[PDB]
């Protein structure tokens, strides 16, 4: 529940540097203190529970959503600002400080990751964290090493409880 740091096991490692295992309080503070955050959402949010949790999180702090993959149909009726973008493209665009963004107001400084695959988001973050200065917070089930801060390894119920506790502190 509250504990999202007791499991940071990995199968293979990218190198010495790894993301910090944070708690729900730290994650909520980091999300609520960002100057210009972007909610990068994969198709794993199509799970109904994760869907409404992500919608509530985006509504709470007015965070634009980048629905990578085929997760756009889960945001058509919800009153949020979600736009489609390829994750490999988005990761390429993030490293360019001259990219106007999804609304033309400039680049972002902090991204939030929820509902991806640990072998694809890690590959994108490999470029993002090495050729840019954008910080990443992973609120997903898996421990993402290539992020800046991430949750630990949690089960489905544990992940739902952690997301709830974040939403209450948002």
Q: Which residues bind other proteins (CB under 8 A)?
A: 9-11, 14-17, 42-43, 68-70, 72-73, 76, 83-84, 86-89, 91-93, 96, 99-100, 117-120, 123-124, 126-127, 130-131, 153
The DSSP bridge partners found for residue 110 are: 37, 135
The DSSP bridge partners found for residue 136 are: 111
Please state the closest distance from residue 70 (CB atom) to other proteins, in A: 4
Cβ proximity to other proteins: between 15 and 62 the closer is 15
Cβ proximity to other proteins: between 53 and 129 the closer is 129
Compute the radius of gyration of the chain from its Cα atoms. 15
Cβ proximity to other proteins: between 73 and 168 the closer is 73
End-to-end CA distance of the chain: 16
Cβ proximity to other proteins: between 26 and 161 the closer is 161
φ, ψ of residue 39 in degrees (nearest 5): -95, 100
Pick the closest to residue 29 from 56, 1, 62, 61 (CA basis): 61
Please state the closest distance from residue 170 (CB atom) to other proteins, in A: 27
* Distances, alpha carbon 65 to alpha carbons 16, 112, 138, in Å: 31, 9, 15
């Amino acid at each position: 529940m509250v504990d999202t740091t007791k499991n940071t096991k990995l199968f293979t490692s990218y190198g010495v540097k790894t993301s910090k295992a944070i708690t729900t309080e730290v994650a909520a503070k980091l999300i609520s203190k960002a100057k210009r955050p972007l909610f990068v959402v994969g198709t794993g949010v199509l799970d109904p529970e994760l869907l409404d949790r992500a919608v509530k999180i985006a509504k709470a702090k007015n965070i634009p959503i980048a629905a990578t993959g085929s997760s756009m149909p889960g945001f058509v009726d919800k009153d949020v600002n979600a736009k489609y973008i390829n994750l490999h493209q988005l990761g390429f665009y993030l490293t360019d400080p001259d990219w106007p963004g999804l609304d033309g107001n400039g680049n972002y400084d902090t991204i939030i990751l929820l509902g991806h695959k640990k072998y694809y988001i890690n590959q994108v973050l490999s470029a993002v964290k090495n050729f840019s200065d954008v910080k990443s917070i992973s609120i997903d089930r898996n421990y993402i090493q290539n992020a800046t801060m991430s949750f630990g390894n949690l089960s489905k119920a544990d992940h739902i409880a952690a997301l709830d506790e974040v939403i209450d502190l948002l």
